[PDB]
Amino acid sequence: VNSFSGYLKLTDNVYIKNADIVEEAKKVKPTVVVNAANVYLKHGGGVAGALNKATNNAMQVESDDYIATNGPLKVGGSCVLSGHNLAKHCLHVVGPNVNKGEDIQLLKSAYENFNQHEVLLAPLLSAGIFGADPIHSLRVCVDTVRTNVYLAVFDKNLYDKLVSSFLE
Ligand SMILES: CC(C)[C@H](Nc1ncnc2[nH]c(C(=O)N[C@@H]3CCN(C)C3)cc12)c1ccc2c(c1)S(=O)(=O)CCC2
């Protein structure tokens, strides 16, 4: 169960690995995988598109049905849906998209959703094309998450910069 391997322990509850979250989910079979979602759960590209493709679009159909009944999420919010073949559950979390003018302060609310789950496999929220400074996102994660989080960051260059930043 939750067979995470090759992670570097940063704090007593935050671990990090240079890895593709999709490959990690297939191997580890975590209780929860976090999706870096948008408010309409449209998994069009990046991490969300990669996780949806790994479910052969089952995540997208389920997401459309959730939105029809419940309406969109708020920025900083989340919902729990099926993990499909990747996990028992997927926690869809909306971090702020700084490139589209959303407030970076909502990154704390986004990470706070992780605290309702004992163990999670997750990406670095609001990084990549969402525009947040990835060293800042790691600092918010470490300061906010209290449950056990395994971060998969699919870029060795960024991984090395994040670990060097944490260890200063
Ligand atoms: C910073 C970046 C390295 C990181 N990327 C990732 N981090 C962790 N696991 C990842 N898998 C893939 C991928 O494409 N998986 C594919 C499956 C099959 N393919 C071989 C490859 C990307 C990726 C990341 C972190 C957060 C966010 C983004 C990107 S974003 O999608 O630009 C906007 C939402 C927030």
Side-chain angles (χ1 to χ4, degrees):
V1 175
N2 286 321
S3 309
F4 293 100
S5 57
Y7 284 72
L8 179 60
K9 183 178 183 70
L10 300 179
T11 68
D12 284 354
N13 70 291
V14 179
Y15 302 81
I16 193 171
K17 188 180 179 179
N18 167 36
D20 178 358
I21 196 168
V22 173
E23 290 306 312
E24 285 298 300
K26 293 191 192 171
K27 288 172 178 131
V28 173
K29 317 168 153 40
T31 304
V32 177
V33 65
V34 172
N35 181 28
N38 58 33
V39 294
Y40 282 90
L41 303 185
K42 288 299 190 184
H43 309 308
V47 167
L51 287 166
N52 177 56
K53 176 177 187 188
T55 77
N56 294 74
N57 205 54
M59 174 184 288
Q60 186 69 72
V61 173
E62 176 196 33
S63 290
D64 287 350
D65 177 81
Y66 168 91
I67 290 284
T69 300
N70 298 274
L73 296 177
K74 291 293 276 164
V75 178
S78 70
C79 69
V80 181
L81 291 177
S82 178
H84 303 277
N85 49 305
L86 297 180
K88 183 182 181 185
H89 305 289
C90 178
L91 181 72
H92 294 268
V93 175
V94 185
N97 183 334
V98 160
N99 286 331
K100 302 302 181 188
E102 298 168 357
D103 181 5
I104 190 57
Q105 297 183 275
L106 291 170
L107 191 53
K108 182 163 208 52
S109 300
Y111 281 115
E112 281 174 348
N113 294 287
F114 288 28
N115 289 325
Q116 317 305 348
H117 299 279
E118 281 298 313
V119 176
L120 313 93
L121 168 63
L124 187 72
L125 297 181
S126 299
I129 73 163
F130 275 34
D133 184 326
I135 283 176
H136 175 60
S137 181
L138 178 60
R139 291 207 192 105
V140 178
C141 186
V142 166
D143 294 339
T144 306
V145 182
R146 295 179 186 170
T147 54
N148 304 300
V149 60
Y150 291 83
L151 295 171
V153 174
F154 193 31
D155 178 340
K156 181 59 169 157
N157 305 294
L158 179 54
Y159 173 90
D160 285 346
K161 281 172 197 328
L162 288 170
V163 173
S164 171
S165 85
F166 174 87
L167 293 172
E168 288 176 356

